[PDB]
Amino acid sequence: TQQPIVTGTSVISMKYDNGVIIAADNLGSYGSLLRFNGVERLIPVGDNTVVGISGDISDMQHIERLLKDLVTENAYDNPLADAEEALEPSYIFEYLATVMYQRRSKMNPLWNAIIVAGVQSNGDQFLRYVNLLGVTYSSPTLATGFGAHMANPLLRKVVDRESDIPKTTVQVAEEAIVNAMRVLYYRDARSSRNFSLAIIDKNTGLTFKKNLQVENMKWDFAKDIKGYGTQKI
Amino acid sequence: TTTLAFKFRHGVIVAADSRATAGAYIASQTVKKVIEINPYLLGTMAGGAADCSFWERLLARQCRIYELRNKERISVAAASKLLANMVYQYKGMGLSMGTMICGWDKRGPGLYYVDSEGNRISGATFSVGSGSVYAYGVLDSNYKWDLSVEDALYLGKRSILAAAHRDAYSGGSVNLYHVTEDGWIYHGNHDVGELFWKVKEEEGSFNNVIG
Amino acid sequence: SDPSSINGGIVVAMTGKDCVAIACDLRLGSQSLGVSNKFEKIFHYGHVFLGITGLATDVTTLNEMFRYKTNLYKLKEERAIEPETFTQLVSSSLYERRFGPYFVGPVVAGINSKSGKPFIAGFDLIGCIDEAKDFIVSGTASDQLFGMCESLYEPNLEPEDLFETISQALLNAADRDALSGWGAVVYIIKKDEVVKRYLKMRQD
Amino acid sequence: TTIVGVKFNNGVVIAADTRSTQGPIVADKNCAKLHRISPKIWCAGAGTAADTEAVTQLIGSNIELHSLYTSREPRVVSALQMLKQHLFKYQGHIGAYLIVAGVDPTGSHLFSIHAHGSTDVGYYLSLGSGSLAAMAVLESHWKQDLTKEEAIKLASDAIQAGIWNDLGSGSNVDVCVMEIGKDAEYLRNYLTPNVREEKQKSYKFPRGTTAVLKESIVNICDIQEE
Amino acid sequence: QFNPYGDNGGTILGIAGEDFAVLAGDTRNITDYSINSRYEPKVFDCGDNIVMSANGFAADGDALVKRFKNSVKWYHFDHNDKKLSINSAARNIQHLLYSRRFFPYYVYNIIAGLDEDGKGAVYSFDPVGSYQREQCRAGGAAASLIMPFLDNQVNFKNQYEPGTNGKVKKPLKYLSVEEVIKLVRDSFTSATERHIQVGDGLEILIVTKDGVRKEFYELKRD
Amino acid sequence: MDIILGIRVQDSVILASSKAVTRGISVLKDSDDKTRQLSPHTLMSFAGEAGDTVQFAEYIQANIQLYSIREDYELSPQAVSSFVRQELAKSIRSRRPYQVNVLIGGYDKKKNKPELYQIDYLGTKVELPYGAHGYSGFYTFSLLDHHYRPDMTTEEGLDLLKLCVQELEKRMPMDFKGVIVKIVDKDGIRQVDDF
Amino acid sequence: MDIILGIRVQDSVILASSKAVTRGISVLKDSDDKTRQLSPHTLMSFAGEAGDTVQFAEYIQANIQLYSIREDYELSPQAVSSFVRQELAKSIRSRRPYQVNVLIGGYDKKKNKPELYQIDYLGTKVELPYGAHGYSGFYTFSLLDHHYRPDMTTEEGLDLLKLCVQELEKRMPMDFKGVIVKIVDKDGIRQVDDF
Amino acid sequence: TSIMAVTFKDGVILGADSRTTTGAYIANRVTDKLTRVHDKIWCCRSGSAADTQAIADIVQYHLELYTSQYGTPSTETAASVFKELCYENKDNLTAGIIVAGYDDKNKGEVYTIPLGGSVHKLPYAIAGSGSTFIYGYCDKNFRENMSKEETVDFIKHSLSQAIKWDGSSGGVIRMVVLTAAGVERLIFYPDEYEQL
Amino acid sequence: TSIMAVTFKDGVILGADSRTTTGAYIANRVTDKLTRVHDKIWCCRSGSAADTQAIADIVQYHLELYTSQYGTPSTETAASVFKELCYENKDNLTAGIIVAGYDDKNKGEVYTIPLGGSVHKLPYAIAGSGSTFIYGYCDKNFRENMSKEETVDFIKHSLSQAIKWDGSSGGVIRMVVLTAAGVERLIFYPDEYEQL
Ligand SMILES: *[C@@](C)(CO)[C@](*)(O)[C@H](Cc1ccccc1)NC(=O)[C@H](Cc1ccc(OC)cc1)NC(=O)[C@@H](C)NC(=O)CN1CCOCC1
Ligand SMILES: *[C@@](C)(CO)[C@](*)(O)[C@H](Cc1ccccc1)NC(=O)[C@H](Cc1ccc(OC)cc1)NC(=O)[C@@H](C)NC(=O)CN1CCOCC1
Ligand SMILES: [Mg+2]
Ligand SMILES: [Mg+2]
Ligand SMILES: [Mg+2]
Ligand SMILES: [Mg+2]
Ligand SMILES: [Mg+2]
Ligand SMILES: [Mg+2]
């Protein structure tokens, strides 16, 4: 049993017709102090998977090393390591899910919420969540922390059920994700303007975008707001 | 729960209700609180359903090995003692069991009370469970050694009914057993809903209730 | 310890076609112990019916209090109080004890003598009104009653059909609750006749 | 609950869902969360249901008496001030979280108020368990210089976000529109996107199914003459 | 302090027929007041004509099912591909549950299938292994809403034959699969109305001698 | 205090109350009368926390005796029981509630009927054919449920009471030092000196 | 369990132990023998928490019986009492201590003297002419301090024991259902069937 | 919260962020923490919003009544009324207030009133959760008798850093200038101050 | 405690105060918080003195053994050993360590290891109770590729303010310069830095 120290906030994601999108800001908070401003919380595994992690950063870095070691271990005595016997999103997730549940069962959890986003061998979209309790679930949209409360409602307006996935393009899906990140910047006190975004498409492969910023923000209306009730000046 | 058992000239009667509870909610009303250890041995269940069931079935396996090794059926005293020592390992750990090991052996009819607290008591009359306090009144006032099997079965049935009526956590149906030297005999499942009205009319009791 | 579940009990009310029905169990307990099988939880002030669940001392107290207030209402207004008006009086009276409340779950049932419109309402222990069209539930088996009423109920039932529906809702909910039962009563209410029926149920 | 308030060109609009809960259980499926303080001043309430009703009736009663005393139409800032001072005095023990809105001779107004007595001003606001789902919609679609029709849509879209994505919110959408120089229009059940489907079976019983012990006529009439 | 348990809501329902059995459960997964998934399967085909659902804390439910499926696999290896009977599976599950008596699987578990005589069978478990066979059983969040309805409409409780006035009960006539599925759908539709953790979807698994069939029905998403 | 019983028969009410008073590990007295005569045909037995019991009983006694003098008329057992209940329901929300449970046994001379009322410290009133407070009813109710008839004689009620007491003396861990028994009928209140 | 007494007279040791076993508000048995014969001339009575009592007594019994067989020789009461004390002093610092208080009464055939040892759950041993465990001694020690002589006969010891029990039955709130009395002398151990 | 008040040659300037939080959720991102108690006496509020609003409302009442009887009150008088409330009700309040005002006689004055109810007259003052991160910066960069433009830049840069490091602070930077000329409201948006 | 490490053109400089407290009592006013784990790899310690000393001693052992087998370790390797201890024993430690070192290949590097056991490579780092008061100042005044003299002034001014506001910080300012030229120890007394 511990308490999280340096933490990462929301990770948001969704499925679209040919793949998945996942995003997360670049902040490492130390309580209310916005301590570290250059933290990458999306970690690619091969060219077909991106693991997005929120929660304790020290545990994130530990998980990052497990995944790096997993790739190394899979290549051992494996001539098809870059082909048929390459790591799949489902393999990577189940491994993490095994670790997370085992750790909670020893009362020494990895204080994280994880979303594994990727595309399988057969082109199927993979998107599943796991957390410190070992609780797992899948949905067309997935989000951690504040994203669950604010991003999911917005993303579910685009993909409300399974049948909406083929009707959703990558441009629409990316637009929804970027808008959600702006909303989280307005309303989450432990978020930053800078973020990373990853697209895993079954045709165009893995596109990893760094140093993105929230833009087109509405603040002008603030000038007209005066006082807290009766004040006019 | 309400469970009871008593020795008498013609063996030992064993009776129990069938209600299972999860707070105020009635989870089940058809549970077997009597356990079939072996054809000459019975066990009651009161308190933790899972605990009672698991340890008594474990006991039953222990008793069977005994028969294989020793070419002889285990005594009621030895059986109750195996249980007692088994649960005593886990004393203070949270186990909740109130049981009665009823049977007939070389010493005649035998009846032992065993609980998770560590007690192991031989006795002619027992009742354990939330409704035990109601059942004891009927038993103590009507219990004799020279009791006919017919009258004895009714006493154990009537005693459960008394408790099922008053205790909110006891009810459902009554399960009856009679243990002879030739083994135990099941004497049926009796719905309290129907049984209550029957007893009221035939006996005249429960006058305060309207029917 | 929980005052709302020491004595136990349930109340349910339903609307029908030009009629209402209100029913209750008869149990009064001290936790596991059953004390009385004649503790009726339904009272009436003229043609307005009030069922109260919860702590029995507060049930008894509130009855005596609403009898007090409705008798004065009648002397001054020169007419019997109506369900809509009584409902507001119950709410007012409960909220005036906001920080030392009566541990009760009242249920109003009746027919407006002028409009002829059937009326039911429920409250939380501090006065929040739940004016439902279909049914109202209260007591230790409220979850059970919600399940029964929500599946068995259909609108515009005739008195003799409504009787069977509400009775079965009560009986089967009570039989899945340790703290409810020991008898049951059902009131069938029409604009100018009221029938009261005692049900036969299991006494455990 | 989910409740919202949205300002527009010539007035203000508020909206709410219609679910009330007792833990995980739904007590009322068509609850009324839009309360009237005065004819053109309405408030939506979240938190302890009795408190939001009681505190609204009380201030509305005192507002009416004040309006009669002053021979003037009541102002929203009066209701706001009276509410926050009352709530502050009870140190949050009256669990009323309200969005207060209305029109008066001064213009159109929109405020939020918390149980401890803090007030806020805004062009768009949201309160309740579904406030985050609603605010996500408002932050995505709100703009300056909205029309009446755009504002009603934004408000109900915000409430829907709560209905679908928040378990504490559900059923229907209520709306009240307060436009300058007009009567306020209270739109009860403006939307009804959660009608129960037809049941597979009828559970109407045969008459005589239930066992009965006694029957008796209940005397509800007064004592008779002669 | 770290709480190793959670509540993912959901509700499940098992009904046993004369020559069939059903195991139903909603597809909603939740934490507190949020929805995780509107479609997350909760009832599984475990092999040997046995269906299973562990409702409550999803992480413990997934682990138990995963272990039982594994227990079935090794039962075949060790006993010459012998079919695991429903009564044998139930006893095995008791031991899976009680092996964690002092750190329980926080789930209410139900299995359904056919007994060795071909009749429908439903077994219900508590979190620590107490099990019993039943004809009708609802487990989970809205179990208290549904079970009284099933007592009334499956076992005909408190129902008597008109004219006799409480002297003669309603006879226990068996139900068909089509009649059962109606009670299941009405049970979940009623539960969805009054319980906030129930909704989104309903997935039913029907077991016959022919195999395991599925049926899916939408529920209210509020 | 510990055990107080009550049984209403055909023409009377019988109240049985334990004799023991205990402070910790010591029995201070073994002949304590846990009852007060409220009026010539109304008797109240009581049990609860020390001090509260007697203070409450005597407070009630004084109020009923005052009423009797003022009106030159004996209140009905029902009227007395309602007065007592209101005092307890008033007490439970006070700064320090009376921790007292009571049984009121009386003979209504107007209706020519015996009446027994059970009232707990919360102000929970119930009219009964037989009743008990505390852990007493747990042992005795099964016997009363079995043997009780409303047409019982006073002598039959006493025999049933002996049976109830015998069961208490067997299964209760606490020694309550027997009971004082009192009968309330048309001719007033008297004590059974041999029990 | 509740009351265990012990008195050493001229030529014997008398142990009196209560008969009642209680689980909460219910007396489970009223004829329980709270003693084990450790050897032909050594008797141990015991009282404490349920389970611990019997488990400990029978564990001690087995060890002494093992010694007797191995050496074909009966240990002295002093040797047995020291063995028991060490087991309890070992127990008190263990993960879960035995919650048991004991009295060891024995006749030393070598010295031709009766001996009584009082040992509590901590391993506190003391040789006494008379002793008690729990709340028993509180009532009885004043009578024993007054009436006790070391030259008393067995019959005089029993009469003094009756007096001690009579005082317990008067002033103890708990009903312990009388006592089983056992005498340990040169001829072995026997039970007084009428007390 | 991040608030400050700074005296300069021509008068005094109040400054504040616009973020109000309920835990990690931002309940309001365009809050006005600069509140008026008299024509040219304003305050910056920190701590409980309910407490600071109730206090400022009472003070505004006291100063309105003071003015009706005795004429325009001093900034010291205003700070005394705040103090009297904050000090006597310290067990039931959580309020950190900065009082700032302009006289023609006394010119620009700044009083800070931390949690206990003590009063401290200063050349400039900083308060709120975000003030901790700019004690070093403000001490190094503050000068007396700055110009209006210099003082605006000082507050802008200071609050910019406070917002950067404190998650409880953010939104826009509001400012209020108090001089003989009158009362001027200023506002600065993220795109302006973040790139400093 | 107030500690910092700053990279510059020629290498890296570590800086720290010299105050150790037991509550409000100053147990030591001339503490050396700059500790050597290898010839040109040093660390700044914050948190529990017992924990940080035990850790640094173990690390020094690991790096001495590393050097005997594999030659001179990297600053990243040193930071990894610190991390491995701080992370795996996080439940029983209270250590906030800044690692700083000089290679000829990698030049000056700075790693910070806060309470959880996470690692963060930075251009400069600040830590300790007194660091809170200089987040604003350090962010505004830090530049990359500063000269030795510029970097010394930056640390001196920064720690000067941290000491000024933090009671847990104080005493002298110690510094350690790590370049290709070698290792230079510096010290600055109150009379020098207080008047800045
Ligand atoms: C009476 C009913 C309660 O006093 C009696 O002791 C029964 C005995 C009993 C014996 C065998 C099987 C079932 C019941 N006990 C219970 O009903 C217990 C009471 C209890 C509740 C909570 C506890 O935790 C501290 C301990 C005891 N109930 C249970 O054990 C309950 C948790 N389990 C079940 O009801 C098991 N059923 C529920 C439906 O699924 C099948 C298994
Ligand atoms: C959503 C549903 C929040 O869940 C919303 O805020 C509604 C608002 C509302 C407003 C007007 C009418 C109806 C509903 N709130 C509720 O539905 C509340 C939820 C709630 C329960 C308990 C609370 O105290 C901690 C606070 C809020 N429901 C109720 O208030 C109602 C059902 N009463 C009660 O549950 C009884 N309270 C009374 C006071 O003590 C606790 C239980
Ligand atoms: Mg054993
Ligand atoms: Mg019962
Ligand atoms: Mg919803
Ligand atoms: Mg001793
Ligand atoms: Mg910020
Ligand atoms: Mg200092």
Q: Read out DSSP for B2-41?
A: -EEEEEETTEEEEEE---EEETTEEEES----EEEEETTE
Number of Cβ within a 10 Å radius of residue I35: 20
H35 touches chain A (CB under 8 A): yes
Q: How far apart are CA I43 and CA F16, in angstroms?
A: 84
Location of structure tokens 């045969």: D206
Q: Name the minimum distance, in Å, from the CA of D123 to any CA of chain A.
A: 8
The encoded tokens of residue G119 equal: 């040992």
Which residue is closest to G27 within chain F, CA to CA? F171
Q: Ligand 6 centroid to F165 CA: how many Å? A: 38
Q: Ligand 2 centroid to D22 CA: how many Å? A: 7
Q: Do C57 and F126 touch (CB under 8 A)?
A: no
Q: What are the CA-CA distances from residue E205 to residues E63, E67, E115, E182, E187 (Å)?
A: 20, 20, 17, 14, 16
Ligand 8 is an ion; its neighbours by CB within 5 Å are: I 163, 170
Q: How far apart are CA A126 and CA A90, in angstroms?
A: 7
User: Which residue among B31, B54, B93 places its CB closest to the CB of E98?
Assistant: B54
* Helix, strand and coil in chain A, % to nearest 5: 30, 30, 40
B23 touches chain D (CB under 8 A): no
C182 touches chain F (CB under 8 A): no
Q: Where do the domains of chain I lie?
A: 1-196
The reply to whether B49 sits in an annotated binding site is yes
Chain F positions touching B205 (Cβ under 8 A) are 145-147
Q: How far apart are CA B9 and CA B197, in angstroms?
A: 31
**Which residue from E45, E180, E176 is spatially nearest to E113, judged by alpha carbons?**
E45
Q: CA gyration radius for chain D?
A: 21
> Best interface-test mutation with C: which of E158, E165, E187 has the largest number of C CBs within 10 A?
E158
Number of C-alpha atoms within 13 angstroms, CB side, residue C33?
A: 16
Q: How far apart are CA A123 and CA A101, in angstroms?
A: 28
Q: Do G173 and F26 touch (CB under 8 A)?
A: yes
Are 3 or more Cβ–Cβ pairs between B and A shorter than 8 Å? no
Q: Give, as one character, the DSSP assignment of residue F134.
A: T
**Site residues for ligand 2, CB cut-off 6 Å:** C 124, 126, 128; D 1, 19-22, 27, 31, 33, 45-49, 52, 95, 128-129, 168
Long-range contacts of I143-150, Cβ-Cβ distance < 8 Å, separation of 24 or more: I144/I7, I145/I8, I145/I9, I146/I6, I146/I8, I146/I9, I147/I8, I147/I9, I147/I10, I148/I8, I148/I9, I148/I10, I148/I13, I148/I177, I148/I179, I150/I8
The end-to-end CA distance of chain H, in Å, is: 20
* Residue identifier of the C-alpha nearest atom 17 of ligand 1: B20
Q: Name the minimum distance, in Å, from the CA of I171 to any CA of chain H.
A: 18
Q: Ligand 7 centroid to A187 CA: how many Å? A: 11
Q: Do H21 and A223 touch (CB under 8 A)?
A: no
Chain C positions touching B24 (Cβ under 8 A) are 5, 8, 140-141, 177-179
3 state SS of C145 = helix
Q: Read out DSSP for D127-180?
A: EETTHHHHHHHHHHH--SS--HHHHHHHHHHHHHHHHHHBTT--S-EEEEEEET
3 state SS of C109 = strand
Q: What is the CATH architecture assignment of H1-196?
A: 4-Layer Sandwich (3.60)
Chains that touch I (3 or more CB pairs under 8 A): A, H
The residue ranges of DSSP E strands in chain A, in sequence order, are: 6-8, 11-16, 19-25, 28-30, 33-36, 42-44, 49-56, 112-119, 125-131, 136-138, 141-143, 194-201, 205-213
Planar angle of CA H3, H7, H8, nearest 5 degrees: 135
Q: How far apart are CA G135 and CA G174, in angstroms?
A: 11
B117 touches chain G (CB under 8 A): yes
Q: How far apart are CA F96 and CA F87, in angstroms?
A: 13
Q: Ligand 6 centroid to G120 CA: how many Å? A: 4
Q: Where do the domains of chain F lie?
A: 1-195
- Reported resolution in A? 2.7
Q: Do D209 and C168 touch (CB under 8 A)?
A: yes
Chain D positions touching A224 (Cβ under 8 A) are 123
Enumerate residues 6+ apart whose C-beta is below 8 A from G15.
Answer: G4, G5, G6, G35, G43, G45, G103, G105, G181, G182, G184
Q: Do B119 and G32 touch (CB under 8 A)?
A: no
Q: Do C57 and F118 touch (CB under 8 A)?
A: no
Query: To test ligand 1's pocket by mutation, which of E91, E102, E105, E130 has the most ligand atoms within 8 angstroms of CB?
Result: E130
Handedness of CA G159, G160, G165, G167 (dihedral sign): positive
Q: How far apart are CA C145 and CA C170, in angstroms?
A: 7
From the CB of E144, is ligand 1 less than 6 Å away? no
Helices E143-153, E177-194: axis angle to 10 degrees equals 150
User: Which residue among B137, B165, B203 places its CB closest to the CB of F167?
Assistant: B137
Are 3 or more Cβ–Cβ pairs between B and G shorter than 8 Å? yes
Location of structure tokens 């000089």: I102
User: Which residue among C5, C177, C183 places its CB closest to the CB of B26?
Assistant: C177
Catalytic sites of H, residue numbers: 1
Name the H helices within F135-181.
136-147, 154-171
Q: What is the CATH architecture assignment of F1-195?
A: 4-Layer Sandwich (3.60)
The encoded tokens of residue E150 equal: 């099933």
Q: In this structure, what are the phi and psi dihedrals at residue C5, rounded to the nearest 5 degrees?
A: -135, 20
Superfamily of domain E1-222 in the CATH hierarchy: Aminohydrolase, N-terminal nucleophile (Ntn) domain (3.60.20.10)
Q: Which fold has domain B1-211?
A: Glutamine Phosphoribosylpyrophosphate, subunit 1, domain 1 (3.60.20)
Q: What are the CA-CA distances from residue A160 to residues B156, C196, D169, E192, G176 (Å)?
A: 61, 52, 18, 19, 72
Chain D positions touching E33 (Cβ under 8 A) are 129, 166-168
User: Which residue among E34, E189, E196 places its CB closest to the CB of D26?
Assistant: E196
Query: To test ligand 1's pocket by mutation, which of B3, B31, B34 has the most ligand atoms within 8 angstroms of CB?
Result: B31
**Which ligand has an atom closest to residue B26 CA?**
1
Judged by phi (left if over 0) then psi (alpha if -120 to 50, else beta), residue A211 lies in left
Number of Cβ within a 10 Å radius of residue C102: 23
Q: Ligand 6 centroid to G114 CA: how many Å? A: 19
Planar angle of CA G104, G109, G111, nearest 5 degrees: 95
Tell me the CATH number at C127: 3.60.20.10
Q: Clarify whether I67 is annotated catalytic.
A: no
Q: What is the span of the domain harbouring residue A88? A: 1-233
The answer to whether the beta carbons of residues B44 and B16 sit under 8 Å apart is yes
Chain C positions touching F88 (Cβ under 8 A) are 57
Q: Which amino acid type is present at position I79?
A: A
Handedness of CA A183, A187, A188, A193 (dihedral sign): positive
G23 touches chain F (CB under 8 A): no
Element (H, E) at I174: strand I173-179
A219 touches chain H (CB under 8 A): yes
Interface of C with F in 84-113 (CB under 8 A): 100
The encoded tokens of residue F112 equal: 């020519």
* Residue identifier of the C-alpha nearest atom 24 of ligand 1: B48
Q: Do B48 and E134 touch (CB under 8 A)?
A: no
H30 touches chain D (CB under 8 A): yes
Q: How far apart are CA I6 and CA C159, in angstroms?
A: 87
Planar angle of CA D144, D145, D151, nearest 5 degrees: 90
The alpha carbon of E220 is separated from its chain's Cα centroid by a whole number of angstroms, namely: 21
Location of structure tokens 């919260």: H1
Q: Ligand 6 centroid to G124 CA: how many Å? A: 5
Q: Read out DSSP for chain E?
A: ----------EEEEEE-SS-EEEEEE--EEETTEEEES-----EEEETTEEEEEEESHHHHHHHHHHHHHHHHHHHHHTTT----HHHHHHHHHHHHHTTTTS---EEEEEEEE-TTS-EEEEEE-TTS-EEEESEEEEETTHHHHHHHHHHHTS-TT-B-TTTSSSSBPP-----HHHHHHHHHHHHHHHHHHBTT--SEEEEEEEETTEEEEEEEE----
**Which residue from D135, D185, D184, D188 is spatially nearest to D159, judged by alpha carbons?**
D135
> Best interface-test mutation with D: which of H53, H89, H172, H174 has the largest number of D CBs within 10 A?
H53
Domain D1-226 carries which CATH code? 3.60.20.10
Q: How far apart are CA H92 and CA D91, in angstroms?
A: 10
Q: Where do the domains of chain B lie?
A: 1-211
Chain G positions touching F27 (Cβ under 8 A) are 170-173
Q: How far apart are CA E164 and CA E185, in angstroms?
A: 32
Q: Name the minimum distance, in Å, from the CA of B144 to any CA of chain F.
A: 15
F165 touches chain G (CB under 8 A): no
Chain D positions touching E196 (Cβ under 8 A) are 21, 24-26, 167-168, 170
